[PDB]
Amino acid sequence: ITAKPAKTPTSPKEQAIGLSVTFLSFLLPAGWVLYHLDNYKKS
Amino acid sequence: MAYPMQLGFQDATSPIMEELLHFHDHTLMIVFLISSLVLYIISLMLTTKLTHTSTMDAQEVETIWTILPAIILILIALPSLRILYMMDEINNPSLTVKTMGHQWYWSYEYTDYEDLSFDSYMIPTSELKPGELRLLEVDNRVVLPMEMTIRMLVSSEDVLHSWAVPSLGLKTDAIPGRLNQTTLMSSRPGLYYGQCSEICGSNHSFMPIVLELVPLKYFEKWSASML
Amino acid sequence: ASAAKGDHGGTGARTWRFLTFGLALPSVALCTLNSWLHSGHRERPAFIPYHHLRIRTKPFSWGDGNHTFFHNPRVNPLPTGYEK
Amino acid sequence: MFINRWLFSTNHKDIGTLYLLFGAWAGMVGTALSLLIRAELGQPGTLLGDDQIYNVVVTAHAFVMIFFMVMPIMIGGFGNWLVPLMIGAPDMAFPRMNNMSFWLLPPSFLLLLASSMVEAGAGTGWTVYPPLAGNLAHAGASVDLTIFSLHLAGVSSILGAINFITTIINMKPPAMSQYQTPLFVWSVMITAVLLLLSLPVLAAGITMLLTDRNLNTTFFDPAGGGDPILYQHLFWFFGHPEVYILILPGFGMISHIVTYYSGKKEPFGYMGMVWAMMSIGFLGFIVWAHHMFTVGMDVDTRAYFTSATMIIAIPTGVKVFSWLATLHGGNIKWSPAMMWALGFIFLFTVGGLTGIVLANSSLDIVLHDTYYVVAHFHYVLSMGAVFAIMGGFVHWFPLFSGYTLNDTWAKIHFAIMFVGVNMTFFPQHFLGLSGMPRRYSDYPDAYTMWNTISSMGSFISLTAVMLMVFIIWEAFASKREVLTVDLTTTNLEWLNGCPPPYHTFEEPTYVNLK
Amino acid sequence: ASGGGVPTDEEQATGLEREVMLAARKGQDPYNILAPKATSGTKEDPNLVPSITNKRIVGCICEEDNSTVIWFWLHKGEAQRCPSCGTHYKLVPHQLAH
Amino acid sequence: KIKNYQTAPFDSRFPNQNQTRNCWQNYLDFHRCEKAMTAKGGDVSVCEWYRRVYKSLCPISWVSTWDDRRAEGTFPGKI
Amino acid sequence: HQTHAYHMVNPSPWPLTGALSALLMTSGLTMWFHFNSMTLLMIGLTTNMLTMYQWWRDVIRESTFQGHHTPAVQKGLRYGMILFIISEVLFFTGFFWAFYHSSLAPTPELGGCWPPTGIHPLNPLEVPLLNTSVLLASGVSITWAHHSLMEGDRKHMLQALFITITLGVYFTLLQASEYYEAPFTISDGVYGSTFFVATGFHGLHVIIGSTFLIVCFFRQLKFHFTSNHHFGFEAAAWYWHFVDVVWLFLYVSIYWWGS
Amino acid sequence: FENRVAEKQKLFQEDNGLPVHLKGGATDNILYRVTMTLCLGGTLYSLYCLGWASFPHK
Amino acid sequence: HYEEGPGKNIPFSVENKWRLLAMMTLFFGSGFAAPFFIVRHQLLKK
Ligand SMILES: CCCCCCCCCCCCCCCCCC(=O)OCC(COC(=O)CCCCCCCCCCCCCCCCC)OC(=O)CCCCCCCCCCCCCCCCC
Ligand code: HEA
Ligand code: HEA
Numbered sequence A: 001i002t003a004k005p006a007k008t009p010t011s012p013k014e015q016a017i018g019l020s021v022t023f024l025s026f027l028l029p030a031g032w033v034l035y036h037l038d039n040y041k042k043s
Numbered sequence B: 001m002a003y004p005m006q007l008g009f010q011d012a013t014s015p016i017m018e019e020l021l022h023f024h025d026h027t028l029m030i031v032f033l034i035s036s037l038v039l040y041i042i043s044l045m046l047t048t049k050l051t052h053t054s055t056m057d058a059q060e061v062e063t064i065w066t067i068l069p070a071i072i073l074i075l076i077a078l079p080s081l082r083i084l085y086m087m088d089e090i091n092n093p094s095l096t097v098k099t100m101g102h103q104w105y106w107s108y109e110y111t112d113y114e115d116l117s118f119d120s121y122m123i124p125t126s127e128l129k130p131g132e133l134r135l136l137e138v139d140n141r142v143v144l145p146m147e148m149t150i151r152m153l154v155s156s157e158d159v160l161h162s163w164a165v166p167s168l169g170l171k172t173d174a175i176p177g178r179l180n181q182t183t184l185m186s187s188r189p190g191l192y193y194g195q196c197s198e199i200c201g202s203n204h205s206f207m208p209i210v211l212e213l214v215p216l217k218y219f220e221k222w223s224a225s226m227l
Numbered sequence C: 001a002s003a004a005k006g007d008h009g010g011t012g013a014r015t016w017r018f019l020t021f022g023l024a025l026p027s028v029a030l031c032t033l034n035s036w037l038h039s040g041h042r043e044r045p046a047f048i049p050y051h052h053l054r055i056r057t058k059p060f061s062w063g064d065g066n067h068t069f070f071h072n073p074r075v076n077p078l079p080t081g082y083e084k
Numbered sequence D: 001m002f003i004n005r006w007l008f009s010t011n012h013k014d015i016g017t018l019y020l021l022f023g024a025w026a027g028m029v030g031t032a033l034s035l036l037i038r039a040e041l042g043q044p045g046t047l048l049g050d051d052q053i054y055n056v057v058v059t060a061h062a063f064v065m066i067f068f069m070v071m072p073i074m075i076g077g078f079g080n081w082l083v084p085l086m087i088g089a090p091d092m093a094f095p096r097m098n099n100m101s102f103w104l105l106p107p108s109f110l111l112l113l114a115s116s117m118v119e120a121g122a123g124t125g126w127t128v129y130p131p132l133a134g135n136l137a138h139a140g141a142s143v144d145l146t147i148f149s150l151h152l153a154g155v156s157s158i159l160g161a162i163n164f165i166t167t168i169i170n171m172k173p174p175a176m177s178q179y180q181t182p183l184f185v186w187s188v189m190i191t192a193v194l195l196l197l198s199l200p201v202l203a204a205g206i207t208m209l210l211t212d213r214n215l216n217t218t219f220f221d222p223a224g225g226g227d228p229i230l231y232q233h234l235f236w237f238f239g240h241p242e243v244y245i246l247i248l249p250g251f252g253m254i255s256h257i258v259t260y261y262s263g264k265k266e267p268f269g270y271m272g273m274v275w276a277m278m279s280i281g282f283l284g285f286i287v288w289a290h291h292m293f294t295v296g297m298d299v300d301t302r303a304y305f306t307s308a309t310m311i312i313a314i315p316t317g318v319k320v321f322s323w324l325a326t327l328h329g330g331n332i333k334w335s336p337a338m339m340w341a342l343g344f345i346f347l348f349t350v351g352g353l354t355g356i357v358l359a360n361s362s363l364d365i366v367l368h369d370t371y372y373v374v375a376h377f378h379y380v381l382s383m384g385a386v387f388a389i390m391g392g393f394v395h396w397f398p399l400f401s402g403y404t405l406n407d408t409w410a411k412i413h414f415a416i417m418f419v420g421v422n423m424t425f426f427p428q429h430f431l432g433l434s435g436m437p438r439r440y441s442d443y444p445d446a447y448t449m450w451n452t453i454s455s456m457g458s459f460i461s462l463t464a465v466m467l468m469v470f471i472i473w474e475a476f477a478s479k480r481e482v483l484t485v486d487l488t489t490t491n492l493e494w495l496n497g498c499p500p501p502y503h504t505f506e507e508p509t510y511v512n513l514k
Numbered sequence E: 001a002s003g004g005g006v007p008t009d010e011e012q013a014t015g016l017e018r019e020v021m022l023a024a025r026k027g028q029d030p031y032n033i034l035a036p037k038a039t040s041g042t043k044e045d046p047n048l049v050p051s052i053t054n055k056r057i058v059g060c061i062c063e064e065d066n067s068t069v070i071w072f073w074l075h076k077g078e079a080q081r082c083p084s085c086g087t088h089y090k091l092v093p094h095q096l097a098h
Numbered sequence F: 001k002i003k004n005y006q007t008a009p010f011d012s013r014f015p016n017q018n019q020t021r022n023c024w025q026n027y028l029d030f031h032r033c034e035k036a037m038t039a040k041g042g043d044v045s046v047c048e049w050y051r052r053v054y055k056s057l058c059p060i061s062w063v064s065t066w067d068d069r070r071a072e073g074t075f076p077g078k079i
Numbered sequence G: 001h002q003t004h005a006y007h008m009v010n011p012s013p014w015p016l017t018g019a020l021s022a023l024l025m026t027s028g029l030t031m032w033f034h035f036n037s038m039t040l041l042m043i044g045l046t047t048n049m050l051t052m053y054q055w056w057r058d059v060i061r062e063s064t065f066q067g068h069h070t071p072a073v074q075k076g077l078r079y080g081m082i083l084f085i086i087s088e089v090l091f092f093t094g095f096f097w098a099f100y101h102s103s104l105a106p107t108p109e110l111g112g113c114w115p116p117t118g119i120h121p122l123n124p125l126e127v128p129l130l131n132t133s134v135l136l137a138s139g140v141s142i143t144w145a146h147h148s149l150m151e152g153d154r155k156h157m158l159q160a161l162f163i164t165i166t167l168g169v170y171f172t173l174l175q176a177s178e179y180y181e182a183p184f185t186i187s188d189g190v191y192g193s194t195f196f197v198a199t200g201f202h203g204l205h206v207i208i209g210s211t212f213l214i215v216c217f218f219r220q221l222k223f224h225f226t227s228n229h230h231f232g233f234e235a236a237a238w239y240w241h242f243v244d245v246v247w248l249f250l251y252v253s254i255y256w257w258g259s
Numbered sequence H: 001f002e003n004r005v006a007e008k009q010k011l012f013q014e015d016n017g018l019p020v021h022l023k024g025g026a027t028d029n030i031l032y033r034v035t036m037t038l039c040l041g042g043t044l045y046s047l048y049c050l051g052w053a054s055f056p057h058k
Numbered sequence I: 001h002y003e004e005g006p007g008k009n010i011p012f013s014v015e016n017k018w019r020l021l022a023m024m025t026l027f028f029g030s031g032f033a034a035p036f037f038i039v040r041h042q043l044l045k046k
């Protein structure tokens, strides 16, 4: 395929943030729940 | 039972299960061969700069790759069906035993002569004895005479369960309102384990099956002692 | 089969109206006669509390939860028998 | 305007887009469930400490992956986008009914998550066999909500099937015979026929489960003369067609992807490929009882179903060999999509061959309700339906968005997923031959090595799913607009540009008869 | 025995249905219901491709029974050729608004 | 007069995995034979073979339920 | 400005109100069965009927009034309706399978016989036979109505169609009666189960089909149909034959052979 | 009755850019508002009821 | 008429890649978290 160069280029810094933020949106909430499992059972 | 890092089938306890292993080796050679041939040929197609992008004639070659696969299926079906009908073949059992599935344990009935029946529950992990197996041991084993044709009748008094003993090649669903026949013949004495093979609620993972295979005289004296 | 009548030249409304009033409605009228003849009530049978009948695994979501939707006191017993 | 366009759509591309969005969200729900599963099995013992909760996780995992991720993406998504464009049709035949097929799915899903939030959920398996699914063993609303979820998903797919069949039959250029329609369109029409015939039998079964639970019927209850095996027959009568429904559009997309990235004007053996997909559709209706080899059925029946199941290998073989034949002498572009498609050909083959092992009723006695079945079907849904969805998505994202993906990030995503799924599912074969039951929350101790490896692999695939989200964000974040697409002469869906306009083929194509 | 009271397409058909119906009475196909008949499609005898714009997608079934359709845009101006078989096609713009 | 009974033998009327009818038949046959005799004076003994087969094959809980229902008047089969 | 014959439909809210009505009826049945309340059901049923009305109304507007129904659009709707009816045959097939399964291998709980011990079946020669006569008659009367319309005959179409509906309603009142009078219930084991659920779904389809015919009757009154364009009428006629043939199968199977 | 189809064809073909579900006039609007209100209100009462049934109430 | 072309044939804005990141994060995030909070919810019920 061929394409125009990016209209709004996304630098390494910017990708690092988007990837970091993406991963954390998945991991924090699951991690919170799995970490508090004992607290849910003893209750 | 299974042992750690086991790859294949539990060792054959009956001659029926002996036949399944040799049929499995057969079928698996064929699987490996085809799987390897597909993997190889993909890589053959993908490893040349040489091109032929024009229209290719499909008649001659479609013959080859329907007839060949069709022959392979027959090479598999033949012994598959030999074994199916051999399994079914009439046996003349010396003995009938019923098993009723329950939430969440097996009940057993030996009622040819006397009214012998007991409940069989998993040994809790906190109550295991030195060298006993987690999730597999039962309070009351199914004692059965070795080297003799036994008829198992399987059923349930609540939900579906299924009565399995992988070493003997056995799995018969346990359905209320229904009595499923199967036949059992251990070539050897010992302990032969199995697990409820139809989801039946909370404790489906925790209602196992232990067969204890001993000589007839020990079986007779056991039975008398269990009344 | 040809059934046994005749017909079948061109296919008009006229033919199908012929069959509507010549065969169809007369058949309905005969079966209506034949029915308003073998009707009137019948010997309601001795109640036996067979376990394969009057099934109750969950109360019905209407009434007292023990009557079926088209309950007829005359011919439908409850699991404990017919009603006074 | 936003409402008139996205809640009131009658446009095949916008509805295809709502489907892909819905599918992608469902995929996340489906994935979380699969990680809870593999968390519980990741070391010996109990994690959730409640094997009804485990049973509910497994049930919902399957409902979500099957009914809310695969079908809506493949048929609702790629189907509404591509089928009209590939036959130069101005939209689908019933473009307003098409919108209701889509809006039935959010309600269907709300019913499933309600099922899991009320009482103790439905710990039944996706098969929902009675009497466990019954009003004694599963008292209360959970199973009824599950039944009603399946009813709405059912109506959605039946109306969709009528829509694709009508559209593909009636809305081709007048000069295009069905033997000039591309293979993806064929895959969807044959899929739609399967959906038309099979779902109404499921609706019957689960409606009879609804009356046993709530109106004192006894269809499946021995006390009233009923039979639980009846429900199995009705469910599997649908359930086998269902699995071919899950893969046929997959086959369609694989055929286009392999053709395109081989730099070929056509797939090898077009008519053979049509024949194969139709044979597979037909045979898929006369094999259902291979799901029932252990319920206690007569030897002759078990020999028929063994034999009828194996036949399917032949037509399926003609597709596999025809894809190798398409590659042969190709000018191969090692694009991300081609990688997915080459992954597909290999893993699907592996999965189908373990299927052929299960076809032998004899062996199936030992393998049934073990992890050997779980391994078989994850090789053909989580390396088959999923790999064909990925290949299609990276291949057609530019058409749908106007934007291009980073090809390097996408090859990286492929590499991570391939290791993930192979580490997750290959060992389950061993767990199966050695006799580990399925629908188990804990296992005897000998099973720990392969369960640990399997659970670790489940995590490597989570990492790919997370990267995927980032990759789609990067594409939209960077905004690299498409210019040129090769092979438009044999890929009509690209020929109106990227994205194509809201209205396409306002002027139909011109095709001579000669 | 009989009578009337039931309108005809000629009396009561309207909008695009009426337009399709009246065009077919004159043997015209403005709404692309019929497959065009090919010419020999040479330079001298090109395939005449009606359009309401200055481009329209052709699809060429190069030979009878071919399953592969070759798709390309035809622009107003000099006769273009099918990239697979070379048969010529010419755009003949403008129409509709009658 | 085979007696020397170990278990119910193969009955060619019931050759497949589902043995429900086999149990049921032998239960009916016994209580039938038992009624013939406990009416016309003779010896339950001639009914014995039906008794041993149904006892061998039938779940305790089925027999138990069938017996309770004979007593109740709700037994659905014909004796 | 299109130069194809097919119908681009205006943005519609009815697909959304349809889907939500589906959620309201299913969650309302759940509310009814389990939490002893009918209000969700009452609302879903209402919005469903409101949806149905406005959607099919719009189809009339689009066709009779705006003329978007070219021969191509009509050919499509034909396929659509044939495909819908096929889907309904497979639904019923599920219940025939159920019936044949239960009745061909009666279980011990039933006395090992069909009919089950304690089931006193309806005489297939009484109201069942009348019902058969009524649906077959309606099959004749709707065919006369079809030929009347094709031949331009307004009065005779309306007469034939009125008759077809009357017979439709007659069947419905008869079935309501024999439901009331039946000595067995839906809870009389698998006999009651198969009987009331199979014939009860049939009964619903008779009402749906009757409703469709009535819509066709009123549209004909307002002169919507021409002698050559009347797909609403053919669809209703196809549906009505379907309902008729399903009844013949129920009669032969449940009422006659199952007696 | 008389054949007033031609009247209706004029009304529904009037070039006012109104969609087909609103083109009949003010009652189309009223009926739509009642339909959409029952649907959206019913769906919120639905979400409340799932709320209710999600937590134990002896 | 509606808007056509890149970033305009979708029901979400791509005008700002950070606003977009928030939306994608909420959307795939609500999906993945939902099961964890259902397990939680059932563990707490008893
Ligand atoms: C994941 C961990 C692997 C564990 C291995 C254990 C070894 C230690 C004991 C070291 C050895 C100890 C000796 C004990 C002998 C016991 C014999 C027995 O009981 O006999 C039964 C055994 C016989 O099986 C075996 O003989 C082992 C299977 C190996 C197959 C070839 C793969 C080799 C590569 C390994 C990487 C796997 C992951 C990727 C595999 C990719 C998917 C197939 O168990 C089976 O029946 C397995 C059934 C698998 C069915 C799938 C068929 C598809 C195959 C496709 C191959 C693609 C080519 C690779 C191409 C590879 C490129 C990617
Ligand atoms: C399509 C169907 C599908 C998919 C994709 C999956 C995916 C996975 N499944 Fe699934 N599974 C089933 C269908 C599927 N499964 C069924 C039907 C059962 C049986 C249920 C029962 O017994 O009742 C089951 C059972 C099952 C068990 C057995 C439970 C038990 O017996 O106790 C396990 C255990 O490992 C498991 C694991 C996994 C894992 C790790 C993944 C995945 O994590 C592997 C990696 C794949 C992904 C993460 C895919 C992500 C795709 C997307 C997100 C789409 C993105 C969208 C766009 C680009 C538009 N599955
Ligand atoms: C897309 C989904 C999909 C597909 C395509 C298939 C394809 C096949 N399946 Fe599978 N299957 C499932 C999804 C699928 N399956 C699921 C979800 C279950 C269980 C669900 C549950 O219980 O919850 C299941 C269960 C299942 C069982 C029951 C096991 C048990 O529960 O005990 C069996 C038994 O025969 C089976 C067989 C097959 C066969 C023979 C094929 C064939 O169609 C495969 C044919 C393909 C090949 C053979 C490879 C390509 C061919 C060649 C390279 C040519 C040469 C080949 C030969 C010579 C053989 N499947």
Ligand SMILES: CCCCC/C=C/C/C=C/C/C=C/C/C=C/CCCC(=O)O[C@H](COC(=O)CCCCCCCCCCCCCCCCC)COP(=O)(O)OCCN
Residues within 6 Å of the ligand: C002, C003, C004, C005, C006, C007, C008
């Ligand atoms: C368990 C029991 C075991 C038994 C064994 C069972 C065996 C079953 C066998 C089935 C036979 C199948 C064969 C397949 C083919 C059959 C014939 C092909 C028909 C066909 O294709 O022919 C065409 C169509 O005809 C058509 O539909 C047909 C047109 C018919 C018109 C001629 C009929 C005239 C005779 C009298 C008509 C009946 C009376 C009507 C009123 C009755 C009221 C009650 C040609 O039409 P035509 O001739 O120009 O005129 C048409 C009439 N207008």
Ligand SMILES: CCCCC/C=C/C/C=C/C/C=C/C/C=C\CCCC(=O)O[C@H](COC(=O)CCCCCCCCCCCCCCCCC)COP(=O)(O)OCCN
Residues within 6 Å of the ligand: C021, C022, C023, C025, C026, C027, C029, C032, E001, E002, G155, G163, G166, G167, G170
């Ligand atoms: C509690 C149960 C109640 C049941 C309820 C349901 C019933 C369904 C019926 C619906 C009511 C509709 C009836 C219509 C009646 C009259 C219509 C008026 C028109 C008329 O009188 O029709 C005439 C013929 O019909 C006529 O005699 C009409 C003939 C009527 C037929 C009735 C059958 C009479 C039976 C007696 C004889 C039986 C013998 C049959 C045996 C042989 C069969 C093989 C012809 O008209 P015309 O000359 O072409 O018109 C001139 C221009 N249009």
Ligand SMILES: CCCCC/C=C\C/C=C/C/C=C\C/C=C\CCCC(=O)O[C@H](COC(=O)CCCCCCCCCCCCCCCCC)COP(=O)(O)OCCN
Residues within 6 Å of the ligand: C068, C069, C070, C071, C072, C076, D151, D154, D155, D203, D207, D210, D211, D215, G029, G172, G175, G176, G179, G180, G181, G182, G183, G184, G185, G186, G187, G196, G197, G199, G200, G201, G203, G204
């Ligand atoms: C002449 C027929 C008139 C029909 C209109 C009257 C009533 C409403 C029901 C109609 C819907 C039809 C089928 C639904 C299922 C079962 C009903 C069977 C028909 C019926 O009405 O049967 C009655 C049972 O009523 C009962 O419980 C039924 C109580 C009502 C239950 C509501 C329905 C719940 C089930 C809905 C499932 C829908 C799934 C469809 C799937 C769509 C496709 C994907 C019989 O009465 P009885 O007192 O047992 O015996 C008579 C004794 N004197």
Ligand SMILES: CCCCCC/C=C/CCCCCCCCCC(=O)O[C@H](COC(=O)CCCCCCCCCCCCCCC)COP(=O)(O)OC[C@@H](O)CO
Residues within 6 Å of the ligand: E012, E013, G056, G057, G059, G060, G063, G064, G069, G077, G207, G208, G209, G211, G212, G215, G224, G225, G226, G229, G230, G231, G232, G233, G235, G239
């Ligand atoms: C107490 C009463 C309770 C009633 C509520 C229960 C439900 C009732 C449903 C009744 C069905 C009504 C259907 C009305 C359809 C009217 C619209 C119509 O008929 O539309 C026609 C096309 O048909 C079309 O779209 C095709 C129309 C397809 C509709 C198919 C309907 C059957 C399916 C209904 C739902 C089944 C549910 C099954 C449950 C298990 C319009 O084209 P023509 O007629 O050619 O006219 C144009 C000419 O005038 C030109 O000169």
Ligand SMILES: CCCCCC/C=C\CCCCCCCCCC(=O)O[C@H](COC(=O)CCCCCCCCCCCCCCC)COP(=O)(O)OC[C@@H](O)CO
Residues within 6 Å of the ligand: D093, D094, D095, D096, D097, D098, D151, D152, D155, D158, D162, D200, D203, G007, G009, G018, G019, G021, G022, G025, G026, G048, G051, G052, G055, G058, G059, G062, G063, G068, G073, G077, G080, G081, G084, G087, G088, G091
């Ligand atoms: C337990 C409770 C479960 C409840 C679930 C109920 C589910 C949904 C709620 C019902 C909402 C339905 C509202 C009316 C829908 C009418 C559809 C219709 O009439 O669809 C037509 C197409 O299908 C055709 O013909 C023929 C097809 C007509 C389909 C009729 C829709 C009824 C759906 C019933 C279920 C179907 C499956 C039954 C088999 C098991 C018209 O196509 P459109 O794209 O609109 O217009 C195109 C234009 O060219 C017309 O001018």
Ligand SMILES: CCCCCC/C=C\CCCCCCCCCC(=O)O[C@H](COC(=O)CCCCCCCCCCCCCCC)COP(=O)(O)OC[C@@H](O)CO
Residues within 6 Å of the ligand: F014, F015, F016, F017, F018, F021, G089, G093, G097, G099, G100, G101, G102, G104, G105
């Ligand atoms: C159409 C032609 C296809 C040709 C293939 C055959 C298909 C169907 C017809 C066959 C039905 C009768 C078969 C006769 C053989 C035996 C019947 C029998 O008895 O079958 C019973 C149930 O059949 C039952 O209801 C079976 C109920 C029917 C299920 C059939 C499934 C197919 C349905 C889909 C077809 C699409 C329909 C399209 C609409 C026209 C099974 O119980 P047994 O195992 O006896 O248990 C007793 C034990 O004590 C013995 O050990």
Ligand SMILES: CCCCCCCCCCO[C@@H]1O[C@H](CO)[C@@H](O[C@H]2O[C@H](CO)[C@@H](O)[C@H](O)[C@H]2O)[C@H](O)[C@H]1O
Residues within 6 Å of the ligand: A027, A028, A029, A030, A031, A032, A033, A034, A035, D035
């Ligand atoms: C299968 C999908 C899941 C994959 C694995 C996800 C693991 C990623 C970790 C992200 O999770 C965080 O871990 C923290 C700890 O590392 C938790 O804090 C907990 O522990 C801290 C100290 O140890 C305290 O400060 C906090 O209050 C307490 O909530 C926190 O809630 C959780 O978000």
Ligand SMILES: CCCCCCCCCCO[C@@H]1O[C@H](CO)[C@@H](O[C@H]2O[C@H](CO)[C@@H](O)[C@H](O)[C@H]2O)[C@H](O)[C@H]1O
Residues within 6 Å of the ligand: D110, D111, D114, D141, G027, G030, G031, G035, G036, G037, H046, H047, H049, H050, H052, H053, H057
């Ligand atoms: C996605 C949708 C999923 C839907 C899930 C299905 C659940 C539908 C159930 C409807 O719930 C209702 O809520 C009422 C209140 O609004 C309850 O009042 C009940 O609660 C209290 C009893 O303590 C008191 O208010 C009353 O006496 C008593 O009737 C009532 O019983 C219950 O039926």
Ligand SMILES: C[C@H](CCC(=O)O)[C@H]1CC[C@H]2[C@@H]3[C@H](O)C[C@@H]4C[C@H](O)CC[C@]4(C)[C@H]3C[C@H](O)[C@]12C
Residues within 6 Å of the ligand: B059, B062, B063, B064, B066, D271, D272, D275, D318
């Ligand atoms: C005749 C038909 C269509 C040919 C055409 O119209 O183009 C073709 C298409 C696919 C062909 C089949 C497929 O190639 C699969 C089979 C291949 C074997 O070589 C012959 C039988 C076989 C079953 C073929 C018979 C016949 O040649 C088929 C059915």
Ligand SMILES: C[C@H](CCC(=O)O)[C@H]1CC[C@H]2[C@@H]3[C@H](O)C[C@@H]4C[C@H](O)CC[C@]4(C)[C@H]3C[C@H](O)[C@]12C
Residues within 6 Å of the ligand: E005, G154, G155, G158, G159, G162, H001, H002
């Ligand atoms: C009103 C109309 C006459 C004028 C016109 O054609 O519009 C006539 C034609 C056919 C008549 C109908 C048909 O004769 C069928 C029915 C006959 C009943 O005797 C009265 C109601 C009945 C439903 C009639 C009502 C009305 O008189 C109709 C509808």
Ligand code: CUA
Residues within 6 Å of the ligand: B101, B102, B104, B160, B161, B162, B196, B197, B198, B199, B200, B201, B203, B204, B205, B207
């Ligand atoms: Cu008992 Cu699983």
Ligand SMILES: [Cu+2]
Residues within 6 Å of the ligand: D239, D240, D243, D287, D288, D290, D291
């Ligand atoms: Cu299958």
Ligand SMILES: [Mg+2]
Residues within 6 Å of the ligand: B162, B197, B198, D294, D368, D369
């Ligand atoms: Mg099983």
Ligand code: NA
Residues within 6 Å of the ligand: D040, D041, D042, D043, D044, D045, D046, D047, D441, D442, D443
């Ligand atoms: Na565990």
Ligand SMILES: [O-]
Residues within 6 Å of the ligand: D240, D243, D355
């Ligand atoms: O399968």
Ligand SMILES: [Zn+2]
Residues within 6 Å of the ligand: E060, E061, E062, E063, E070, E082, E083, E084, E085, E086, E087
């Ligand atoms: Zn050409």
